[PDB]
Amino acid sequence: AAKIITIVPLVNDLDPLDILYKLLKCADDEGIMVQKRIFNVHIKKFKSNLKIIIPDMTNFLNILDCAKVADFVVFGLSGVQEVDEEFGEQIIRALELQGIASYIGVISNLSAVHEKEKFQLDVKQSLESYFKHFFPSEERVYNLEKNSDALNVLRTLCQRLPRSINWRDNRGYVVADFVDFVETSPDSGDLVIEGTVRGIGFNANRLVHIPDFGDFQLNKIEKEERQLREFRDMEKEDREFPDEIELEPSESAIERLKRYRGLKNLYNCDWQVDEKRLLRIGNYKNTKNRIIKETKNEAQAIAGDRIRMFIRFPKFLLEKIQDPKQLLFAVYGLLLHEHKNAVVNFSLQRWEQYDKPVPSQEPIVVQYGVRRYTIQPLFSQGPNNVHKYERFLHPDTVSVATCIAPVDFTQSPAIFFKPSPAKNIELIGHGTFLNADHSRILAKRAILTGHPFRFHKTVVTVRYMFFRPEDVEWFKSIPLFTKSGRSGFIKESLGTHGYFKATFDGKLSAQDVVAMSLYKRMWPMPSLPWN
Known part of the structure; x- marks a missing residue:
């Protein structure tokens, strides 16, 4: 070998x-x-x-x-x-x-x-x-x-x-010396591969991964400056005023806040894992160790074996295969169920000297292990099982990026990038695959603020939070607070432009800022492979 x-x-x-x-x-x-x-x-x-x-x-x-x-x-x-x-x-x-x-x-x-x-x-x-x-x-x-x-x-x-390298050694891999094809049907055939087996081995009853081609079944085995400034400005906004929403006199609060629910504190959230066909896993740690033990045992070709590997392979892809003695042709085993999508969680920390903002939901690519996907991640921090969604990757701490991608049962390193003609690529982040865990709930906060300006002992009256009575009325029942730690409740609408009267704990001043807090459930987005 x-x-x-x-x-x-x-x-x-x-x-x-x-x-x-x-x-x-x-x-x-x-x-x-x-x-x-x-x-x-x-x-x-x-x-x-x-x-x-x-x-x-x-x-x-x-x-x-x-x-x-x-x-x-x-x-x-x-x-x-x-x-x-x-x-x-x-x-x-x-x-x-x-x-x-x-x-x-x-x-x-x-x-x-x-x-x-x-x-x-x-x-x-x-x-x-x-x-x-x-x-x-x-x-x-x-x-x-x-x-x-x-x-x-x-x-x-x-x-x-x-x-050793954990992610690649706990699956099998092979470097191809010879690559030849063999017809078996009108649409497909057998890509025949010769090389030495490395890693944990191969089993014909399993799938195989070729970059950048995809996953395949085994038959048998024989022995620019514009976008930047806009995102930059939104990053500054969210940075100075998180997670503030500013209603204008013109718009409807009912319509702007449409998906939001009442919630002051995030530890009191009692949302279930309800509905917006994925894999769901009991405990990730345990089943990971079951799967690796399992695949090691069931392996039929073992490190050092010279192998002739027949891969169920479509003909229209033959054009893309190039000489295995000139470019690398490598084949990685997949573990049980790594084909199946699931709600997944990576960890992520900015690259050295990476200034540009990286916002949630924006097209980004992950390499994790050998696989490479375009994901649209949701960022949050490291509790009670619900986490605050952050609209932008925070400045200097490690975050959790969650989405729907295929599971990985080693805990592969992760590298995050975009394409960008540098070295044709832009390296933005790094971390590792933590998790399949669809119990991680992502909640986006919204803060409305208003100014108290009239004080009749018990009753404050507030303006410039809402700008229409019918908005005040829709949200009547959501608790108020002040940044100074008081707690409140709207009594009644006052006038025609969104003034309301509210009662509170302690006395307030015209320096106090009264606010209202709402949260929107955030759903992990799908992804697709990248070549």
Whole structure:
């Protein structure tokens, strides 16, 4: 069974094939050297097989995807060019946040630094400290031009036990060496795949996932600036006045507040899980552990088995499949029921240095594990089982983004992004799949404020909350409060423009602000896959 190595140059001045040559050369075997993008090589020197993947370096997602399947990631650093904040640095961060196995840093490049040798070494040392910043396990950064440093790296790749990646190792996966098709019906056929099994294995009675194609059945197994400023302005509004609603004299409160219900305090909410065909799960923690135990047991092809895998595959997709020795063709097992949609909950924290606002309900993409979906999330905070909906992702804390997507039964890392011609993509967030839990109720608050201005001992009279008597009358029965902590109730309508009379606990002043609080139940939205 081969160790999967992928080479990731963190600077565009580095040629990935140069790193490969230097690594291969320090095995005295000119029968390796003469030998488009994914290579199987024997190392008769450490008696080891390596499968070396060079991603398409001009596609961020392809990079991420080669790194997923990797046992070792070899990072190329540059002696003369700085790592780019917007590209290579982001590769480092995306690589860790999605889950990375083992990793080693190299320079293929030192001689390009045309300065005294104390200087060159101190550039290496500075690369070692930039690297240690992200990968503390990694003291040294290996000079691939010094033979004995090249040999070190090679020996490690061949012999050292790889680190593990939870989400991908608790499902099965395979990197395809050969891919061929076979007709069986007019509309479809068998996509035949050859590779070594990794992970927990495969069972023919299960589904299989190919990015970016979808889920498939197994037959058998053989051995721009405009939108920004508007969202920015709404973010500022919601920020200064949450969750205020300002009625105008012209409009109807009955019609504006149409889906809202009376509710002061959020711990007193007694909404059921009623109606606005999804999977619902008793306890997520337990069934997760049942499913993984189950699939491990029922597996028929086990890590290290050479496999011929027949996948029920439609013909119109054949056009999109490209050479498995040039781009990566990988196949991930799905666990029981990961095909089925459910009310799902991720966690989410802004990316480093991400300024732009990220509002609820807006098209965003998640990668979680290997899957990628366009979701429309509802944000809220970390109680009594109901949570305050927040219209915008808060500034500097972790939130819960809930929606309807297919369940994940590892607890895959999550990375959130939009497309944006940067590196054709815009990285906005990161977190992990927490949950299927349709008991999480999302409630959106609305605050109406009014000004008390006449005081007859017991009775205050208030204006500019409502602007029509018939609005005052519709909402008569919702409790009032003041930000100073008093509690109240509307007595009667007063006049014709929404003045009302209200009685309260204590005495109020004309500095006091009286308010009314309403909540609207917020329903998780559906999502669809992304390619």
